[PDB]
Amino acid sequence: HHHHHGWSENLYFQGSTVRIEIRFTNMRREEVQKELEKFKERLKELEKRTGSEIRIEIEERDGEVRVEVEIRNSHEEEVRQIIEEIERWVRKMGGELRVEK
Numbered sequence: 692h693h694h695h696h697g698w699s700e701n702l703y704f705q706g707s708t709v710r711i712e713i714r715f716t717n718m719r720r721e722e723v724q725k726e727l728e729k730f731k732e733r734l735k736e737l738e739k740r741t742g743s744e745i746r747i748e749i750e751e752r753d754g755e756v757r758v759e760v761e762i763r764n765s766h767e768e769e770v771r772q773i774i775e776e777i778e779r780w781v782r783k784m785g786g787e788l789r790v791e792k
Contacts, residue, residue, distance in 0.1 A: 704763060709770050711760045713777050715786025723756065726780070733776055734760065741769055 717723045731747055738745040743766070748759040760773055774790070781788045 706764050709762045709765045710791040712789040713758045715780060715784045716755055717784050730776055743769055
């Protein structure tokens with residue numbers, strides 16, 4: 692018998708949005724997991740002390756990790772800070788970073 696499972700999410704909003712994406716391959720799976728849990732916690736802190744809204748998407752496939760951060764109602768300072776916490780991953784583990792203004 693044939694089966695289908697589907698899931699979708701649609702977001703409709705207004706305002707400015709900055710998107711930051713990183714992709715890397717790692718060989719410290721549990722370490723990176725705890726760093727991602729720390730990074731999510733830092734983004735929640737940064738969102739709390741600002742008027743912005745922050746969405747983070749994480750995809751993991753056997754060591755390949757892709758992270759997407761979207762910031763709505765952002766200010767330049769807040770974008771610059773988020774890159775910084777991300778820059779450590781790119782520099783230390785190698786990988787790719789992409790900024791969509």
